[PDB]
């Protein structure tokens, strides 16, 4: 019998079974309502420093596969689920979830009341916690580690997950039939985008490559000057973990880009940095948004899209600068989801257009970028 336990800051304990690596995990506990897409979620860098709870009770029905990885590794600090299924049952599976978790040295626990956890978080707001998987897990110890956690508010995480060295990306999106395509020859891509890695998701780039954009990924702290020197066709701001505010370097740089006429597009963290760089404020959400059924309105066109969301921080509408116009708003709670510079060719989205996992409703947002790039090229 393999004990595991999850202790939140408030002192609440969840006793269950270890399904991953042995040891301890500490971070911010969040809940995700996605019924499918657990692997993609796990490998999402935005989760760095977060203990992920899944609302759907059976997690792992489809095993895992590399194609469903959104980064090189699993970023989630820990995993919490209700039930780990006896078997994975899917033609695409290459490894059961449990083996996968152990292989990635992930501390995870199953067999707990994820709904109780969920309600608490929804009601009292985000908390930090600690999971201890092992023989006689010590509650007091987990408690102490959860209380000792510093907290994501004000924590710069983009710097922690960003790319050491800059690089190139020319690969497109997966297909049932084909699978993950082969990288594209530079000469094959009309456009050239510079993408700031604040802990970016492979699908974002794949989806960009898909639009005929050639990419150069750079470390988050890359200077605007350095960037300009490459003559980008447009710039791109990636998603990423923790507080966007403390990212002085990226904001500053951004401000720089905006003095130019290059088209800029940001997603999630990117969206926030871009707001920031335009003089807007950011606030940490009560529990944030994590799931894939999130209704977002295109206020301009008065249409809804079901979106992929994963954010704990949000842009304050009220503090919004006049040069920033609102393009989208959550239908669930009314928070800000999209913005556009009135004066410059720059816009961003809070949700995740590239999805993975989730609905494809937002993908078109990309297209608008591409339009901006084409027009800059005209000029």
């Amino acid at each position: 019998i393999k004990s595991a336990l999850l202790v939140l800051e408030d002192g609440t304990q969840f006793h269950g079974r270890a399904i991953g690596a042995t040891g301890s995990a500490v971070g911010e506990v969040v809940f995700n309502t996605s019924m499918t897409g657990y692997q993609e979620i796990l490998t999402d860098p935005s989760y760095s420093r977060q203990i992920v709870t899944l609302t759907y009770p059976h997690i792992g029905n489809v095993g895992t596969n590399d194609a469903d990885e959104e980064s090189s590794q699993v970023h989630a600090q820990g995993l919490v689920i209700r039930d780990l299924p006896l078997i994975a049952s899917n033609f695409r599976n290459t490894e059961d979830l449990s083996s996968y978790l152990k292989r990635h040295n992930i501390v995870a626990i199953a067999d707990i009341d994820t709904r109780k956890l969920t309600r608490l978080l929804r009601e009292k707001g985000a908390q930090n916690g600690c999971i201890i998987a092992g023989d006689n897990p010590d509650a007091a110890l987990a408690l102490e580690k959860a209380r000792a956690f510093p907290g994501l508010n004000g924590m710069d995480l983009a710097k922690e997950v960003t790319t050491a060295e800059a690089y190139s990306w020319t690969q497109g999106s997966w297909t049932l039939t084909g699978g993950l395509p082969q990288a594209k020859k530079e000469d094959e891509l009309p456009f050239h985008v510079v993408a700031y890695d604040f802990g970016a998701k492979r699908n974002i780039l794949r989806m960009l490559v898909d639009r005929g954009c050639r990419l150069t990924i750079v470390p988050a702290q890359t200077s605007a000057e350095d960037v300009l020197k490459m003559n980008p066709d447009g710039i791109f701001l990636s998603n990423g973990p923790g507080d966007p505010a403390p990212c002085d370097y990226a904001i500053t740089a951004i401000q720089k880009f905006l003095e130019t006429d290059i088209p800029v597009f940001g997603i999630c963290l990117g969206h926030q940095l871009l707001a920031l760089a335009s003089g807007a404020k950011t606030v940490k959400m009560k529990f944030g948004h994590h799931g894939g059924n999130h209704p977002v309105k295109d206020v301009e066109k008065n249409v809804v899209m079901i979106t992929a969301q994963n954010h704990g921080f949000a842009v304050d509408e009220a503090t919004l600068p006049a040069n920033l116009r609102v393009t989208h708003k959550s239908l669930f709670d009314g928070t800000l989801q999209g913005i556009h510079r009135t004066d410059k060719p720059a816009f961003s989205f809070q949700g995740h257009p590239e999805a993975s996992p989730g609905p494809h409703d937002a993908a078109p947002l990309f297209d608008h970028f591409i339009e901006l790039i084409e027009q800059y090229r005209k000029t």
């Binding site: 309502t33 609302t55 009770p57 029905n61 209700r82 039930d83 009341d113 709904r115 799931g291």
Partner: protein, 358 residues
């Protein structure tokens, strides 16, 4: 789960195909697939308590019947699947015959193994840890009593002793992302209870008729709705117990409190235990709630309306005949029998042709 009535149609082909033959359906909610499924089996009203066996283990011909039943699905296939596991067939073998995803199959096999342990360990081995674990998988006290060779009531008492009762969760459309003011609940064995029953009102509980079948349909639901409507209007807190998805009675709108549960003694007593209703009505959901009447009453349930006993006077053909006799009314030439020999004897007298009425 679909509900069939093949026994009513003797010369009918009873294998399932692309042309529907079911008469109704049952629905269950559970925190897990196993829990959900077991609850549905017991809510089907076919007299199951979960995966009751269909063939004897010591039947030499058993492996042949099973294979038949698996390969060519009839209405009882689900039970034959668990029988296949009891007989030594593998998940792969069963898959090959049925084409049912192994994802599911493995879960059923697991239940079968648990059953086997209970059989072995008997009541004595049903420790709180184990019992809990079993309850968590959707095991009905009755199935467990069957396996341990005891009375269902003993299992129930045991649970009580161990303070082992289910919690109630609520349906909300959003995996708890948002709060709900509605009370559409379901049972499960977990930590937090979300039932939060009133103390404020006078409550009346209405027991629905489960899945629709021939002889027990929408009429019964119509009454249940009306009972719910009328009383609520009168100012009573109405509580509905039912698991037929096709119904208005299972529509949240219909009552103050809705428990989307199996209409079983177990399921109902658990509800009664926290609601502590003023009365429970058992005459508006067909045969099912009627058969439970005595047991409910015996168990302390404040059944209102015509008494289980009075019901018994009518439902029991010897009692009824009696009464008629008591009232000096006219009935035809009849008799009440329990064995063929007696019945055979009993029929010469009465006369042919005669009507066999259970």
């Amino acid at each position: 789960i679909p509900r069939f009535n093949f026994e009513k149609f003797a010369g009918a082909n009873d294998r399932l195909t692309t042309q529907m033959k079911s008469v109704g359906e049952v629905m269950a909610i559970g925190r897990t697939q196993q829990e959900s499924l077991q609850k549905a089996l017991r809510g089907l009203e076919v007299g199951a308590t979960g995966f009751d066996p269909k063939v004897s283990l010591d039947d030499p011909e058993a492996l042949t019947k099973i294979r038949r039943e698996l390969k060519d699905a009839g209405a009882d296939r689900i039970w034959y699947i668990a029988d296949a596991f009891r007989a030594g067939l593998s998940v792969d073998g069963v898959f090959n015959l049925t084409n049912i995803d192994r994802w599911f199959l493995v879960q059923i096999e697991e239940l079968v193994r648990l059953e086997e342990k209970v059989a072995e360990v008997g009541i004595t081995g049903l420790n709180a840890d184990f019992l809990r674990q079993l309850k968590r998988k959707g095991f009905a006290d009755a199935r467990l009593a069957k396996l341990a060779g005891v009375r269902e009531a003993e299992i129930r008492k045991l649970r009580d002793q161990y303070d082992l009762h289910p919690v109630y969760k609520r349906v909300d459309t959003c995996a708890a992302e948002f709060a709900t003011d509605t009370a559409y609940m379901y049972s499960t064995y977990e930590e937090e209870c979300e039932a939060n029953p009133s103390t404020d009102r006078e409550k009346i509980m209405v027991l629905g008729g489960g899945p629709n079948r021939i002889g027990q349909g929408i009429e019964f639901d119509y009454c249940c709705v009306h009972a719910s409507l009328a009383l609520r209007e009168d100012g009573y807190e109405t509580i509905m117990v039912n698991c037929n998805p096709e119904t208005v009675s299972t529509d949240y709108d219909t009552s103050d409190r809705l428990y989307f549960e199996p209409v079983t003694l177990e399921d109902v007593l658990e509800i009664v235990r926290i609601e502590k209703p003023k009365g429970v009505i058992v005459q508006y959901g067909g045969q099912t709630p009627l058969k439970l009447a005595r047991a409910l009453e015996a168990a302390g349930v404040p059944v209102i309306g015509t008494s289980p006993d009075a019901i018994d006077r009518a439902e029991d053909r010897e009692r009824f005949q009696h009464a008629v006799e008591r009232l000096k009314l006219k009935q035809p030439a009849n008799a009440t029998v329990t064995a063929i020999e007696m019945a055979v004897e009993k029929a010469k007298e009465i006369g042919y042709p005669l009507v066999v009425r259970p």
